[PDB]
Amino acid sequence: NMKAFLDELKAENIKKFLYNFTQIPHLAGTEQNFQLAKQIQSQWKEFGLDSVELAHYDVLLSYPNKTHPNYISIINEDGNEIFNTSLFEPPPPGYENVSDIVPPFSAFSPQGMPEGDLVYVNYARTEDFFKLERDMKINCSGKIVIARYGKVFRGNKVKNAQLAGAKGVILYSDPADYFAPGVKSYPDGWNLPGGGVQRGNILNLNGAGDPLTPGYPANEYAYRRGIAEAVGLPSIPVHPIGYYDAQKLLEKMGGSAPPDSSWRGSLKVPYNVGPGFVKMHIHSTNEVTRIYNVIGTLRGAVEPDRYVILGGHRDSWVFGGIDPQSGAAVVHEIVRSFGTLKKEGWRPRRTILFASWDAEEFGLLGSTEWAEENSRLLQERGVAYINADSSIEGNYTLRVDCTPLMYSLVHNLTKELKSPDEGFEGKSLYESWTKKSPSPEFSGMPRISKLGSGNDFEVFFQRLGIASGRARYTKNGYPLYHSVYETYELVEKFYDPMFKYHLTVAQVRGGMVFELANSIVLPFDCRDYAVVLRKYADKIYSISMKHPQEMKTYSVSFDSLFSAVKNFTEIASKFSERLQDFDNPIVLRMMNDQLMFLERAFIDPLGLPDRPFYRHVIYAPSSHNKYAGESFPGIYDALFDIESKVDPSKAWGEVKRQIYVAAFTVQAAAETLSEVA
Amino acid sequence: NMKAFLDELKAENIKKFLYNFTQIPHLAGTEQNFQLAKQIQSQWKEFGLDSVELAHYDVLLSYPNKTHPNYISIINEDGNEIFNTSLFEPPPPGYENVSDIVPPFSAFSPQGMPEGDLVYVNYARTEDFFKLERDMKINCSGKIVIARYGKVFRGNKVKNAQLAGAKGVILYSDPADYFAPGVKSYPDGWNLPGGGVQRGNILNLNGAGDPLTPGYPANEYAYRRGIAEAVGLPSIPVHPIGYYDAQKLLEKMGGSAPPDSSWRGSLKVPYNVGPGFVKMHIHSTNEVTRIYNVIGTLRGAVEPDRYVILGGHRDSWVFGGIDPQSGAAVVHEIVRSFGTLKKEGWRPRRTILFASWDAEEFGLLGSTEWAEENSRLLQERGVAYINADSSIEGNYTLRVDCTPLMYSLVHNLTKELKSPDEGFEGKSLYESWTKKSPSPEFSGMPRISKLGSGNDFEVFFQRLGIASGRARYTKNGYPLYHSVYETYELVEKFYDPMFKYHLTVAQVRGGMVFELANSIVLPFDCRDYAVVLRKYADKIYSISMKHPQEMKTYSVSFDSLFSAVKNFTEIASKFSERLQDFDNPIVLRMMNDQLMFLERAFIDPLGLPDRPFYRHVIYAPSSHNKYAGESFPGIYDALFDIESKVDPSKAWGEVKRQIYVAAFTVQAAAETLSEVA
Ligand SMILES: *[C@@H]1O[C@H](CO)[C@@H](O[C@@H]2O[C@H](CO)[C@@H](O[C@@H]3O[C@H](CO)[C@@H](O)[C@H](O)[C@@H]3O)[C@H](O)[C@H]2NC(C)=O)[C@H](O)[C@H]1NC(C)=O
Ligand SMILES: *[C@@H]1O[C@H](CO)[C@@H](O[C@@H]2O[C@H](CO)[C@@H](O[C@@H]3O[C@H](CO)[C@@H](O)[C@H](O)[C@@H]3O)[C@H](O)[C@H]2NC(C)=O)[C@H](O)[C@H]1NC(C)=O
Ligand SMILES: *[C@@H]1O[C@H](CO)[C@@H](O[C@@H]2O[C@H](CO)[C@@H](O)[C@H](O)[C@H]2NC(C)=O)[C@H](O)[C@H]1NC(C)=O
Ligand SMILES: *[C@@H]1O[C@H](CO)[C@@H](O[C@@H]2O[C@H](CO)[C@@H](O)[C@H](O)[C@H]2NC(C)=O)[C@H](O)[C@H]1NC(C)=O
Ligand SMILES: *[C@@H]1O[C@H](CO)[C@@H](O[C@@H]2O[C@H](CO)[C@@H](O)[C@H](O)[C@H]2NC(C)=O)[C@H](O)[C@H]1NC(C)=O
Ligand SMILES: *[C@@H]1O[C@H](CO)[C@@H](O[C@@H]2O[C@H](CO)[C@@H](O)[C@H](O)[C@H]2NC(C)=O)[C@H](O)[C@H]1NC(C)=O
Ligand SMILES: *[C@@H]1O[C@H](CO)[C@@H](O)[C@H](O)[C@H]1NC(C)=O
Ligand SMILES: *[C@@H]1O[C@H](CO)[C@@H](O)[C@H](O)[C@H]1NC(C)=O
Ligand SMILES: *[C@@H]1O[C@H](CO)[C@@H](O)[C@H](O)[C@H]1NC(C)=O
Ligand SMILES: *[C@@H]1O[C@H](CO)[C@@H](O)[C@H](O)[C@H]1NC(C)=O
Ligand SMILES: [Ca+2]
Ligand SMILES: [Ca+2]
Ligand SMILES: [Cl-]
Ligand SMILES: [Cl-]
């Protein structure tokens, strides 16, 4: 039983595994990450899994030239290089003989050497570009931003720079965003030093996976596009720097002043938007490189053709002390603990798949390619996907993002768990979590957020429509994210010395997987979807109601969507009444298939407009505001900035079309829960 | 049991129903076709079905103006109208007071009145246009074809006329194709009179359904495209005529002579290709019009969430004596006969749905819109679709088109059936059928053809991947197709006076539905798919091998596809070994779900290139040669006329890409039949 599974999970094992995974870099495509997969594969066999295989793919990765390094430069009238930005970050104490620490870089930047003049675009948001462009008539055709990391995914920032004429992008981490007041820089606290740099890719893949093989696995015989026709590649060069090097670049800045205090950071500098009072040197290659996923299987006893997936990435930028090895060490113990039960002759009712994804930091490629190869199995047999990236990004409370179908599983599960929090000894995890992080949407309940994008759950949820969730410990990003300073020491000393937060996360993830793989009726409550569908309908109605005149002229009705939502509510009601009153494997299967296929019902096979790989009509990143935008993304995007569009009847036509699509889809989902005949 | 079901089917009932359905026209969108649906709905209730509902949709139909009629004209230098083509066909004996016989027309032709000069393009094929264009340097920018009906679907002919610059299309039925030697015209034989005209739509929908709502059901709140953005509408006017009126138009024809005897018909005329030695008058409107499908349900006893569908259209051009009421009368008796068993307390193991589709003659709209609304139910619960259009187009033997998954069901089923043929009394239907129509592909077995397109099975098979078949009696089209002369009398006197062919077809369709709805293991044999996948791979390899040089230069390998096919063969083998050795409802369900989802595995969610609604990678009409082209249509189309392409490496790149897509898909389908964990 469940208590058995949980009591076998130990914090010391997690510590032991974390240390084991974090002593060298495990960058996607390198021999070191191959050896770590081989090790995971042995260990998962030893732990008891029925099978453990490597699944490999040949995907487009990106690396800096080991002999013509990347850097930015200040240049005078006569073309001399005054300031040079750092080539490496200062390694942390005791890691000076680290072999193969890849230097800071923006994965997938084209090579270039553009000269030109700075322009500070704040966070390089849509909002921020509407500030320069719309109000202050600033124009960047030929100019170079400079932008601070934060708020939005970094690929949107480069996309936004592209759209707006820019010819280079410089990315830096400002202390306002990544320097917690009152705590010391690493190694003496958990803050970002001035020499630290956030790595990361700057792709805009919109769920496509490997840029060369959209739709199909990058296997041994795959036909690859040319780099010219590739999906999501930037056209302008990009490089990240720490705040010491950004000081130098930003201090001599002139032109217009900042519009307000929200456009100024905490460096002792004017934060002058420019233009004028820079030369980039990049040099990174793209190359097809083999990646390795590890897939463990624990065959179910009664329903072996029904899959519950616990999955997380293994690849790191450098040591990945938090991101992802704090997740992977939790997955390792969970596997050990399941295999322990298995060894005592137990099996789960459904099959559990365990995955160690590769090349996640390069655009979710391991998970995506694997899903593309097995989409047929996943879509007819996939019960649920629990992600397992970073277990901690803080030590305050639990963060859960999941489909509404899993709200009660998560509420119930955490009432049976002991809080690890200071001043909540004896109290439950439900208790601490809901005291520390209450629901804004009412009432005496914890906040659970929407699943968005940008981790490995993406392909499962947003393309395939498999019910997904994630859980981790969070703050009230985290400063050392994607720098060399992200180490085991960072976690043992400053984040979780007992490893009690790690263990709590393991119990939430492990217990979710347990409940999903073992409970006789799937632990989904479709009435929860009904409740949020109403909220989301109200929300989107409100955004439209900021244009009352246009709604009258073009006859923009939301009646169909509210009608669909009401029907969903009634049918889901009648359906849960039936789920309680019934005995008989076939009736059981049928009702579970209905529960399982419900999330699937929200997938439109045509996808969203210009994003064929985002097929979920309810959730699914907005094309503009990515995780930051709203649900019913098709309607939200049709409405976004609609007052600016040239042909209003055409633009309002498309709002109506998206109302239709959403209403139809909600009604169709509902009807999967009607009696079957 | 089955013999019970079959013995209850009676020929007299079929006769009785056919007469009942054929006394007035039942054109899509008219009150008469509404009343016929209401009647079917009552009767299906009376017969015993658990439910029978109307499902309606508002779709784009097309009608001639009842007061400004359509016609073609010959015109002199001074603009006078010498020859006028007929306004109606001469009604058959006893039907002179037929109310609301719609006159001959080409459904969905735009209105126009173009003047210009004839050009005879034979059957207006791709092949035939390569004759004029490539060899004889004939050029039609501004000219009017004239073309004979035959060989290809009539919409391809108008598409081909469009592509080639033409400004009108005239369609006529030549006696060479529609006049069987030695038999008299209707009413004294079954031949086409000179006054008879083939109606039909000329859409190129490529599976889209309602031209205004591609992807989504045309329901009460649907957003409709503008006619300008509509899918598959022709741009040039089109009108059909009988051969008496075509004589007049073709006799004064000059310019170049016919290239051979395959370009000349059997009218006493030169068959001069033109140009020169005509004015069209059209006038038809398009309008959104309500259609009504009738859906009957016979709830299954053990697996009510698994659907077997028997479906056929009800709408006719005029009386529909063969097309479709000879099908629908068979469906009616089948339903009666199932409901009879039901009334004696029996139920099928799986649910059976019975459908009377509407607006099929207007581009498969009833079936398609219904499938678009219920795609989610169909794709997870759909076992099989048996079509039920025209039961007879001849009286020689059985024609069966079906997925390879149904070969053995059909072989087995016909060995248990009595042949209705002259000189085969006592012998089985398998016996007559295979003597009369042997397999070319070896050996002592009957020919079974590929399912193509152009009837209501299309959306189920080609878009949704639901295993489908059809069966009918055929000749060694049929002359009166889509004319007013297609009557009950045509069938009772000349085609099937006993109604013994009708009854044989009812037993084949009914017994297929019976076996599929009742057998404990689904009656699919996946090894049959393995066999034809090899044939299809060999075939497509051969077409490519006509370009050996280019295969060397661009490294065009079919290794991946043969490898995929071999794996399919091995896995399907191992899978049938398991299907025989096993006991336990859950294991039964699982193995059936594997069998059921196998056809589904051949669906690519991205569709074929520029045809998003044809998603089956194996079958599925070619973009060029439609039912006439080959399997692996994506590869076939990439290769078609490839020597003419401007950029050979780009064109050969796309052949390779389609090899990849096909190989991947075959491998992925196979793997659904591997052990599940
Ligand atoms: C939510 O569920 C209800 C069913 O409880 C759906 O109501 C349906 O609404 C349409 C009108 O929007 C009705 O259409 C009407 O059909 C009659 C013939 O039946 C026709 O003569 C009228 O002109 C009209 O077109 C439909 O029958 C009605 N069904 C009911 C009330 O039982 C509603 O559409 C559902 N919402 C969505 C978004 O699907
Ligand atoms: C049909 O099934 C067979 C399996 O029986 C598939 O064979 C597989 O073929 C590829 C090469 O095309 C092998 O890849 C190799 O992997 C090794 C590591 O395992 C690597 O070091 C090599 O460089 C190479 O990339 C694969 O392992 C092999 N599996 C076998 C023989 O067991 C074949 O691909 C299937 N056909 C299709 C179209 O899927
Ligand atoms: C992480 O732990 C594993 C195993 O617990 C270590 O791998 C083993 O190392 C010993 C000593 O070299 C060998 O006997 C085995 O060959 C290894 N087993 C494997 C690879 O599965 C591994 O070295 C540890 N890593 C670190 C850096 O401490
Ligand atoms: C979470 O727990 C609640 C309360 O225990 C469960 O809801 C009850 O479920 C039982 C068992 O089927 C019913 O008999 C009760 O009537 C339910 N009570 C309420 C308040 O609804 C709920 O099923 C659990 N959710 C899960 C496991 O998904
Ligand atoms: C086809 O058969 C049906 C019923 O067997 C006939 O419909 C019935 O006609 C009688 C006489 O008008 C009425 O009592 C009923 O109202 C009808 N029932 C219905 C519509 O379900 C129908 O008229 C026949 N059609 C023809 C042309 O013979
Ligand atoms: C069609 O009939 C053949 C021959 O009767 C069936 O094949 C046999 O099926 C039985 C029953 O499971 C097996 O024990 C035999 O070994 C099979 N014989 C052969 C020659 O394969 C076949 O299953 C039937 N096909 C259907 C109903 O789909
Ligand atoms: C920056 O790098 C270049 C290339 O090595 C060099 O010429 C230049 O002087 C450098 N600047 C400094 C301060 O070293
Ligand atoms: C861990 O816990 C203490 C308790 O408040 C807190 O002060 C400290 O900020 C936490 N560490 C991190 C990295 O957030
Ligand atoms: C053809 O129809 C037009 C329109 O009614 C008429 O003017 C013309 O003379 C007709 N030709 C004949 C032969 O009646
Ligand atoms: C029906 O049967 C006879 C037998 O050969 C044949 O001569 C006649 O052509 C058939 N009728 C039709 C319409 O094919
Ligand atoms: Ca791919
Ligand atoms: Ca439609
Ligand atoms: Cl996570
Ligand atoms: Cl048919």
Ligand SMILES: [Zn+2]
């Ligand atoms: Zn991560």
Ligand SMILES: [Zn+2]
């Ligand atoms: Zn990361």
Ligand SMILES: [Zn+2]
């Ligand atoms: Zn028909």
Ligand SMILES: [Zn+2]
């Ligand atoms: Zn027809």
